[PDB]
Amino acid sequence: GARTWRFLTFGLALPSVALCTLNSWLHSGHRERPAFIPYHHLRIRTKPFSWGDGNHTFFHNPRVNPLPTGYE
Amino acid sequence: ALAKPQMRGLLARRLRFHIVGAFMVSLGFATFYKFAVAEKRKKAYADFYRNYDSMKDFEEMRKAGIFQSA
Amino acid sequence: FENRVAEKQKLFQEDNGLPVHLKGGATDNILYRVTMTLCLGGTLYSLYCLGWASF
C-alpha cells in the first residue's frame, strides 16, 4: 500500500539523499587545476562552435577547461 | 459402351509426375552449366599451368616493351 | 482548490458543433491563429532562407 511506500520514501530514500547531499557539500571545495599538455586528441576543433567566439565549449569553465592554446 | 476412366485426383496425379520432371529438368539444366562452364574452366586452368614457364612469359612481355621495371 | 470537473464536462459536451480544439471558446481561436500564423509564416521564412542559401 501507500503506507509502505511512504515509509520507504521517508525511512530509506530521503535519508539516503540527505546523506549523499551532506557528503557532496562537505567534500566539494575546488581541487587541482590539471596541468596543461596540448594533446592532439583533446580540445578538438574541426569547426568553430556556433556561439561565443567559436572556441569556447558550452559549459566552458575558465578554472579547469583549457583552450587549444592553454588556460585563459 | 465406354469404359469408366479415372475421375478422382487428376490434379494430384499430374503434380506427382510433373514434380519429378521439374527436379530432373532443373538438375539437368544446372548440371549442363557445371559441364559447359565449370568443368571447362577447371581444365583450361590445369592445361594453362601444366607446363607454364613464368620466366619465358616474362621475357616475352619484357621484349614487347610492356614494363616500367625492365 | 475545488473539483470543477463537472463544469468542464458540461462545457466540452455542449452541443454546438465545434471541434475539440476550439470548444473552450474564444481563447482557443486566438491560440490556434497564433500557432498556425507562426507555422505558416515561419515556413515562408524558411523557403526564403533556402532561396538565399542556394547561391
Binding site: - | 521439374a22 532443373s26 544446372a30 552449366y33 586452368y45 599451368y49 612469359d57 616474362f58 621495371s69 625492365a70 | -
Partner: protein
Amino acid sequence: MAYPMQLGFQDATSPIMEELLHFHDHTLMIVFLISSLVLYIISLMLTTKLTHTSTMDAQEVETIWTILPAIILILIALPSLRILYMMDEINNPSLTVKTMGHQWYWSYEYTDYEDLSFDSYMIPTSELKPGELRLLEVDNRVVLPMEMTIRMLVSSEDVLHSWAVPSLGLKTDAIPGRLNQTTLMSSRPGLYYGQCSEICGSNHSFMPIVLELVPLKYFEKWSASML
C-alpha cells in the same frame, strides 16, 4: 583487366582468385538449379484446366520445403567457409608493402629496408600514350615480385577509399587511423589493374591501381633505382 563484352570474372592471377572462380561456378550452378526449379513450377501451376480450390493440407510439405533448402545452403557454406579459413591461414610473407589512399591518388611505401615511397596518379586521357588504357593507367606502377607471398597493408590519409585488384582476388578498405592487411601472390608476371572501391568524392572514378609483376631480380633493381 576487363575486356569488351565480358560476362564473368577477370581471369585469375592468384591461386586465391582461382578458388573464388570455382566457388562462384559452384554457387551459380545452385542459383540456376533453384531459379529453373521455380520457373518450371510456376509454369506447371499455370498450364492446367484442372482445379482444386477447397482447403489444402499444408503440413505434408513442411519437411522437404525446409530440409532440402537447408541441405543446399550447407552445400554452399561448406566450400565458402573452407575458402574463408584457408585465406586466413598463417601468412609468412617475404615482403611488406603499404598503400595509403588519398583524394584522389594512391601512395606506396616499401619500408622493409630503405625508405622507398611514391605517389601513383591516373594518366589523364589527353596524356595517354598510343594503345594505353583510358582511366586505368598510372604514372608510377606498384612493382612487385611474382611467385612470392606479399603482405599489403592499406590505410588512408583522408576519407575512405578501398584498394582493389580483381584479378588477384583483392579488395581491402582504406580507413584513416586503421591499418588493414591482405596478402597477394601472383602466379604470373604482367600488369594487373584495379580501381578505387569506396566513394571518396570528386575523382573516385579516377584513382586506379596498377600492379607490375616481375621476377625478384627486376623488383630489386627497380627498388634500388626508385630510392
